[PDB]
PDB file of C-alpha atoms in Angstrom:
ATOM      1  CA  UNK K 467       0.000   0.000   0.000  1.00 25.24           C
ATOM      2  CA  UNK K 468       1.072   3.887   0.952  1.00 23.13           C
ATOM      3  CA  UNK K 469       4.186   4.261   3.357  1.00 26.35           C
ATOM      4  CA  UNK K 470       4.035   7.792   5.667  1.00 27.81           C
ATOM      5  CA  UNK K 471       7.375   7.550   7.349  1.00 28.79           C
ATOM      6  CA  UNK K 472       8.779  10.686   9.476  1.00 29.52           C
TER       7      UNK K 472
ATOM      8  CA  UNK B1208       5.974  16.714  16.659  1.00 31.15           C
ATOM      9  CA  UNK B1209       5.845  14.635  13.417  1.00 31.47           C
ATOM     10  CA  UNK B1210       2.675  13.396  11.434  1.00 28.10           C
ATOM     11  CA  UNK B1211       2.502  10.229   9.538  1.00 26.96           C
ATOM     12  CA  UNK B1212      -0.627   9.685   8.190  1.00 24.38           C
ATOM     13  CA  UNK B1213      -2.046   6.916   5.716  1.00 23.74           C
TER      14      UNK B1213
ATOM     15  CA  UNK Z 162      -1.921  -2.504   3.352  1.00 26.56           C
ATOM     16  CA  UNK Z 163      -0.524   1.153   4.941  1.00 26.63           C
ATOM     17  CA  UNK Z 164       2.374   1.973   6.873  1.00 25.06           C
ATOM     18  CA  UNK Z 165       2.427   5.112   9.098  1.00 24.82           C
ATOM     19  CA  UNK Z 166       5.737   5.555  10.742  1.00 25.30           C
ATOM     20  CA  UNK Z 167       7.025   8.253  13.572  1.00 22.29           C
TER      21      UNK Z 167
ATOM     22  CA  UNK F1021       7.708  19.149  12.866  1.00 24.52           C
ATOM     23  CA  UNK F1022       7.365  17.316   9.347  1.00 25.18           C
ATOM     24  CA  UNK F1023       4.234  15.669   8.180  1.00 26.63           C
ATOM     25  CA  UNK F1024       3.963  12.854   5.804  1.00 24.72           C
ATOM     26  CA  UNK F1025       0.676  12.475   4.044  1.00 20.11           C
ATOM     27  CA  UNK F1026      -0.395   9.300   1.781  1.00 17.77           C
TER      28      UNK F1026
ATOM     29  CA  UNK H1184       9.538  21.696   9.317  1.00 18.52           C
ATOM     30  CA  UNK H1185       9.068  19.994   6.039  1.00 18.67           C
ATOM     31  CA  UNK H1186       6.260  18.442   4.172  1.00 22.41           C
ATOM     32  CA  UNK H1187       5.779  15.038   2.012  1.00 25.36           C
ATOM     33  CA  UNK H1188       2.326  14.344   0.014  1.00 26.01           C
ATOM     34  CA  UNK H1189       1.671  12.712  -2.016  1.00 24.76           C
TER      35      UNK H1189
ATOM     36  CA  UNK I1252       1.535   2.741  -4.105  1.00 25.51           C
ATOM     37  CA  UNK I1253       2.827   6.087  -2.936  1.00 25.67           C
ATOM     38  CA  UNK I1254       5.323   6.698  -0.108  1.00 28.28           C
ATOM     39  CA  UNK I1255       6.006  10.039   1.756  1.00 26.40           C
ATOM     40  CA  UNK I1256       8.684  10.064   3.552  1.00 24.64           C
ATOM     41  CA  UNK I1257      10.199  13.033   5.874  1.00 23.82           C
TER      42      UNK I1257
ATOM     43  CA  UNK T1227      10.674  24.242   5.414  1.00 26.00           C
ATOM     44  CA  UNK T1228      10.699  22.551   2.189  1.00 27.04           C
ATOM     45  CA  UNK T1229       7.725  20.758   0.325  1.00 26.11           C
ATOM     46  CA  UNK T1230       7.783  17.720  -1.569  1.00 25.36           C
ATOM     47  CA  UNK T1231       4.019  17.002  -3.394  1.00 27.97           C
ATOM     48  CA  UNK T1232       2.994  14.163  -5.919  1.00 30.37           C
TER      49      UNK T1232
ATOM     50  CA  UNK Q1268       3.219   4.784  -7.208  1.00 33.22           C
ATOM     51  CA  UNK Q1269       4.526   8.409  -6.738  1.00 32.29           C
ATOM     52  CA  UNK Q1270       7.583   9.368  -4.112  1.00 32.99           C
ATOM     53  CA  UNK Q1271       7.323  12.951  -2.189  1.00 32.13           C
ATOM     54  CA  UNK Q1272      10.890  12.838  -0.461  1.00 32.16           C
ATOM     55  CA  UNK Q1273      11.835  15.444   1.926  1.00 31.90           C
TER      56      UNK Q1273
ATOM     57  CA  UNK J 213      12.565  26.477   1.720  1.00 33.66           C
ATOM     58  CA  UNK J 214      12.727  24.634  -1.570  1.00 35.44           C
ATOM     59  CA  UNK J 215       9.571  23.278  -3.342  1.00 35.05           C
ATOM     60  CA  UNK J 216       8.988  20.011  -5.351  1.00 35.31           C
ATOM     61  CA  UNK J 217       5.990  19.388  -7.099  1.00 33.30           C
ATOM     62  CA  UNK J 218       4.861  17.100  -9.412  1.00 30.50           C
TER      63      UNK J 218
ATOM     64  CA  UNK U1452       4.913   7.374 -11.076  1.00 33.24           C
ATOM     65  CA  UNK U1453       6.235  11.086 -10.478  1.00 32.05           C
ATOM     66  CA  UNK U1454       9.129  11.594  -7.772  1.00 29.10           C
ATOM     67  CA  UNK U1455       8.870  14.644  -6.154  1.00 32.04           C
ATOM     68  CA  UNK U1456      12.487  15.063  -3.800  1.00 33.78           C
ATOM     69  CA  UNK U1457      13.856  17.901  -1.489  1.00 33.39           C
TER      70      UNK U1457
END
């Protein structure tokens, strides 16, 4: 799927 | 802080 | 599926 | 701070 | 800070 | 799929 | 700071 | 999918 | 900052 | 896709 990382 | 959203 | 990192 | 959006 | 969309 | 990263 | 879209 | 790097 | 957009 | 880095 969709990876946000921070 | 930081967001990471998905 | 999604991967929300911080 | 820093915000990822996906 | 900074910002990632996408 | 898509992948913001910060 | 800085902006990355997509 | 698309990258937003920052 | 710097901007990236696409 | 598009790559959008900074």
């Amino acid at each position: 799927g969709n990876n946000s990382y921070s």
